[PDB]
Design a protein around this ligand. Structure first.
Ligand SMILES: [Cl-]
Lengths: 75, 189
């Protein structure tokens, strides 16, 4: 069976180490986007990964609201 | 057993095409071909209605009715409708992966190879323009925004890619525009 959207999400961000803590706190990706810097301080995420998580959350919230044009990413 | 074919086809048409005017067009299309027996025109007419990935299975539904004498030119003219999944491993080569990629969750469409540098690593391994990248590093990408997928591709030294050949490219050329689709041979320009 597939990874949850939360898992793929953290995986993409090098944040996979937090999947076991997010699950113990019953944080799906739905709940994750409802989290503030202070929410993530409460579960003892340190400043570095807090910034990376919230950066990723905010990029996602924005493009879901304003997709813009289709773009070609050269790899 | 002919009425079985007609029924099956008529409901797969009803389910995959909303507007009655496009249905009417589709049936007129095949009916014209049934009089002309010109198969190049039939596929050329079919593509203006089967314009999006959800409708592509109608090329296979139409297909058993094609005479064998036209069967192979039908295949030359259709996108490859094989559902098989090609899996691939690409390495971080001085010219890189050698592909360009568009789509993602924020657009409500999958992630497609839009450009393939001839002779590069992606072409070495047999990826093609018009493949939908279904999986990366073993993960389904259906919930990933475009930038998330690019991130996921860049996480490790190599990247596992499994594609399903679609044959269409998503086009929306700025935010105002509704997303639509084009066949590969046209999109290149
Ligand atoms: Cl998965």
């Amino acid at each position: 069976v597939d990874a949850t959207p939360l898992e793929v999400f953290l995986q993409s961000q090098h944040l996979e180490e937090f999947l076991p803590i997010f699950m113990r706190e019953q944080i799906d990706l739905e709940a994750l986007l409802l989290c503030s810097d202070e929410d993530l301080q409460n579960i003892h995420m340190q400043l570095g990964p807090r910034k990376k998580v919230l950066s990723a959350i905010d990029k996602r919230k924005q493009v879901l609201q304003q997709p813009g044009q289709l773009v070609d990413t050269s790899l | 057993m002919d009425r079985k074919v007609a029924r099956e086809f008529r409901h797969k048409v009803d389910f995959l095409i909303e507007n009655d005017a496009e249905k009417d067009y589709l049936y007129d299309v095949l009916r014209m071909y049934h009089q002309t027996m010109d198969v190049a025109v039939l596929v050329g007419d079919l593509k203006l209605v089967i314009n999006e990935p959800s409708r592509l299975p109608l090329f296979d539904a139409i297909r058993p009715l094609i005479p064998l004498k036209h069967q192979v030119e039908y295949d030359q003219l259709t996108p490859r409708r094989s559902r098989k999944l090609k899996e691939v491993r690409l390495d971080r080569h001085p010219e890189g992966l050698g592909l360009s990629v568009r789509g993602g969750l924020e657009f409500g469409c999958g992630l497609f190879i839009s450009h393939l540098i001839k002779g590069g690593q992606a072409d070495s391994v047999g990826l093609q323009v018009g493949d939908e990248i279904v999986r990366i590093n073993g993960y389904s990408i259906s919930s990933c925004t475009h930038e998330e997928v690019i991130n996921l591709i860049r996480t490790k030294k190599t990247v596992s890619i499994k594609v399903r050949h679609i044959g269409l490219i998503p086009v929306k050329s700025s935010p105002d525009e509704p997303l639509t689709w084009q066949y590969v041979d046209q999109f290149v320009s």
